[PDB]
């Protein structure tokens, strides 16, 4: 019984190519180029999953450092403050406070220096 390629190769290609929509040029038109582009896109997606967390953490540390310096202290001193103060709100929430709750974040400064 002969089992030609039949429909398999075509269908698999349509899978990878439909995944390759929106790529520049042959990277979204040829199955071969689209395959390889989807490989590198895969590892990219992985290391950017792992990356994005450190990324937003750097954002949070930046904005929080801004709000802290606008009260006379800096990021390291402030974090040492809260850590000494037994406060455990994290970088994201301190960021959204320092943007949205300048008064609340202000009191966070007051207890940070309160540790001092």
């Amino acid at each position: 019984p002969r089992a030609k390629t039949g429909v398999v190769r075509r269908r698999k290609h349509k899978k990878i190519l439909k995944l390759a929509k929106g790529y520049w040029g042959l990277r979204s038109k040829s199955f071969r180029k689209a395959r390889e582009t989807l490989f590198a896109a895969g590892n990219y997606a992985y290391a950017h999953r792992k990356r994005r967390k450190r990324d937003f953490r750097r954002l949070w540390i930046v904005r929080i450092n801004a709000a802290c310096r606008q009260h006379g202290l800096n990021y390291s001193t402030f974090i040492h403050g809260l850590k000494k103060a037994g406060i455990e709100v994290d970088r994201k929430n301190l960021a959204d406070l320092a943007v949205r709750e300048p008064q609340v974040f202000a009191e966070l400064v007051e207890r940070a220096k309160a540790a001092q």
Partner: protein, 140 residues
């Protein structure tokens, strides 16, 4: 709870005295204000740092023998087209271009960086045509 992004904010002008301050340090703080990383609403992917104007760029000061031992060089692409320029001559000609070079050395690259450099305005001497923009004086 996504991280907050601010809406578009009008850039707040800032005047800075070039006089009496060290080149590298002053350029540092200039770049800092330029990035807008003094603002809690900071975001990297958008230029929301403040406009900056400086006067008395000639009045900058630099440590040691850097007056002459620092050679701003350029390159024309032509053979032997490496044009070395000492710091003194560059002061006599284009001190504002001195600060331009120093702060541009500190800005993040990319089109955002170039637009940020556009966001800066140097003026050697004590004056500048931006009183209409309300240049807020800010000591550093």
């Amino acid at each position: 709870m996504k991280t907050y992004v601010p809406k578009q904010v009008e850039p707040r002008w800032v005047l800075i005295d070039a006089e009496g301050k060290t080149l590298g340090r002053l350029a540092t703080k200039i770049a800092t204000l330029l990035r807008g990383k003094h603002r809690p609403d900071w975001t990297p992917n958008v230029a929301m740092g403040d406009f900056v104007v400086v006067v008395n760029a000639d009045k900058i000061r630099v440590t040691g023998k850097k007056l002459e031992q620092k050679i701003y060089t350029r390159y024309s692409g032509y053979p032997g087209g490496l044009k070395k320029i000492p710091l003194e001559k560059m002061l006599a000609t284009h001190p504002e271009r001195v600060l331009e070079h120093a702060v541009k050395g500190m800005l993040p690259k990319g089109p955002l960086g170039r637009r940020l450099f556009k966001r800066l305005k140097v003026y050697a001497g004590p004056d500048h045509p931006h009183q209409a923009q309300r240049p807020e004086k800010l000591e550093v």
